[PDB]
């Protein structure tokens, strides 16, 4: 069975939610109900199988390349993502970005400030994620921090399942060429499962699902919610997520 | 002198007791001062082999302390009756 993790200061979380982002009934919707819903579904989709012994991160890595297990992958992704996000907005387990994080921002985002990159993240989430998705600030193997936007339950770890492009609507030739290159690179792998190496790891994660903002913000105003999230990150966690 | 380490310069019941204490942890003092051996049968058996008849000495002995402990032992030696009786005494103490 997969069980929802116990959070630090759960009583305060149930009484007053997360200050400056979520009310009590908002955090209950996004964690104490959504995470329970996802863990129950994952348990029902993996019980009596090998995957029941693995953590959601390992499940999503194992099932990422198998088309028919996509539903499990989705669950295993959202669960994982939903705890990456909650963990880095929890009040505590005044935190400030580390020198290393800001140094890597200056070395990645054209020597820009952190607030400018925050505004870029607001813009990226506003445009490239129609409906449900996730916003990430991720570190590649090149020590480069970049902004990644996944639709629905795409993962930041494995690029063939990023789901960063909405193919329901029209796409630019640049995006199509990107997809073609990624398809060729996937075909380049020799492993019979057809998997590839991808060392991208998430530094910051924001939940753009309606379970996070809809109750407290409204149908619009997701930009306000994302702004509140990024202005009130738990920088102890975010600083620990960067390799020293 | 050039005595090798582990060598000594230059009765049977004593050697039986020492060997059996080393091999089985039984008390040597009891064996030496409270057991009496009595040979029961002493035979020459023989085996026919392609190179002639090979004779062996066979000894069946009994040992005991006259206090409810008794043991039979058999020993066999192609060289001497002393050796067959020694092995029989050994076996008898082991079978107490």
């Amino acid at each position: 069975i997969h069980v929802v993790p116990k959070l630090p200061n759960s009583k305060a979380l149930l009484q007053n939610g997360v200050p400056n982002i979520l009310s009590s009934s908002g955090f209950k919707t996004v964690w104490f109900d959504y995470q329970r819903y996802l863990c129950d579904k994952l348990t029902l989709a993996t019980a009596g199988q090998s995957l029941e012994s693995y953590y959601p991160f390992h499940i999503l890595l194992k099932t990422a390349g198998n088309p028919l297990q996509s539903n499990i992958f989705n669950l295993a992704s959202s669960i994982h993502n939903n705890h990456l996000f909650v963990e880095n907005i929890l009040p505590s387990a005044k935190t400030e970005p580390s020198r290393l994080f800001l140094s890597k921002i200056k070395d990645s985002f054209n020597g820009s400030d952190w607030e400018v990159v925050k505004e870029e993240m607001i813009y990226r989430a506003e445009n490239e994620v129609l409906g449900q998705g996730w916003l990430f600030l991720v570190e590649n193997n090149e020590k480069k921090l970049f902004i990644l936007t996944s639709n629905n339950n795409g993962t930041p770890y494995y690029f063939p399942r990023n789901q960063s492009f909405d193919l329901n609507s029209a796409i630019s030739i640049d995006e199509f060429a990107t997809l073609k290159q990624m398809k060729e690179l996937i075909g380049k792998s020799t492993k019979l499962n057809g998997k590839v190496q991808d060392w991208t790891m998430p530094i910051i994660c924001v939940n753009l699902w309606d379970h996070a903002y809809l109750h407290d913000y409204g149908v619009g105003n997701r930009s306000k919610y994302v702004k509140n999230v990024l202005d009130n990150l738990n920088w102890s966690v975010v600083n620990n997520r960067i390799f020293s | 002198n050039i005595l090798p380490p582990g060598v000594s310069l230059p009765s049977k019941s004593a050697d039986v007791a020492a060997g059996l204490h080393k091999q089985t942890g039984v008390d040597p003092d009891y064996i030496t001062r409270k057991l009496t051996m009595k040979p029961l049968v002493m035979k020459r058996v023989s085996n026919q082999t392609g190179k002639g008849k090979i004779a062996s000495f066979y000894a069946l002995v009994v040992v005991g302390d006259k206090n409810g402990m008794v043991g039979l032992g058999e020993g066999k030696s192609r060289e001497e009756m002393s050796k067959a009786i020694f092995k029989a005494h050994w076996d008898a103490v082991r079978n107490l």
């Binding site: 997969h2 863990c39 012994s53 060392w199 790891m201 | 091999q23």
Partner: protein, 266 residues
């Protein structure tokens, strides 16, 4: 922490070793995020977290497969009283009796370890080495898993007489005293022999009988119960069942050892 590693330069990417350490940092912190796993069997935990004898239920013996006996065509009828019935062409072992015998044998192991006696764990089937080694190491005991040399007890001088021996104090602390050749040459007989596969270890059982060593064994549907002092009816063919019973006995021995050290520290 990680000596003789040369970091990379900020201009250049992560190296393979830097990537390894980076994903280790990820693994210990964030890889386990999302859900905690409950009520799922992990094979290693039978060895490192065996339960106490008092906490064992029939259900946990059954989940380990201890109840699954030999084919009814290979029945040794002297094991009749241990059997619960037959199901799917095999005999089922009565796990109530298994639990009672297991608690008795565990108490014997605990008592012998508490008295500072020597405990030997014998199992010569394929993948039993890990459990035997861990049982020995947590009981301050001894084990064999490769092969039982016939005569290891009844011919100890010719076999085990050459290997080294050691004087130890009440706390099992090496004294590093020099032993005499006579002391080194003596037999050092186990105080308790526990055999995981007694059917393939008749030599050891007979030697223990001759050498007068009490013995514990896992007795399957084809094994002779009277050849051991303290039988445990159970499946001797499954590594899970064998490791469950062995871990129980090893923990009982560990508790006996802990009690001995406790009073020797008071």
């Amino acid at each position: 922490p990680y000596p003789n590693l040369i970091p990379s330069a900020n201009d250049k990417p992560y190296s393979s070793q830097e990537l390894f350490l980076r994903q280790l940092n990820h693994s210990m912190r964030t890889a386990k995020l999302g859900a905690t796993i409950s009520k799922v069997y992990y094979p290693h935990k039978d060895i490192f977290y065996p339960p106490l004898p008092e906490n064992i239920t029939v259900e946990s013996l059954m989940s380990a497969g201890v109840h699954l006996g030999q084919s009814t065509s290979l029945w040794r009828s002297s094991t009749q009283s241990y059997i619960y019935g037959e199901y799917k062409g095999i005999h089922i072992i009565d796990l109530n009796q298994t639990l009672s015998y297991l608690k008795r044998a565990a108490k014997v192991v605990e008592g012998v370890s508490e008295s500072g006696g020597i405990i030997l764990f014998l199992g010569t089937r394929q993948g039993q080495k890990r459990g035997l080694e861990e049982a020995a190491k947590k009981t301050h005991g001894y084990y064999v898993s490769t092969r039982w040399i016939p005569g290891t007890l009844t011919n100890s001088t010719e076999i085990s007489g050459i290997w080294e021996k050691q004087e130890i104090d009440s706390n099992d602390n090496p004294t590093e005293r020099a032993l005499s050749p006579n002391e080194t040459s003596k037999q050092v007989k186990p105080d308790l022999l526990v055999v995981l596969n007694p059917t393939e270890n008749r030599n050891a059982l007979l030697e223990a009988i001759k050498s007068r060593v009490p013995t514990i064994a896992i007795i399957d549907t084809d094994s002779e119960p009277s050849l051991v002092t303290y039988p445990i009816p159970g499946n001797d063919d499954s590594l899970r069942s064998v490791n469950f019973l062995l871990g129980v006995l090893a923990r009982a021995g560990q508790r006996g050892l802990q009690n001995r050290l406790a009073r020797n520290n008071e």
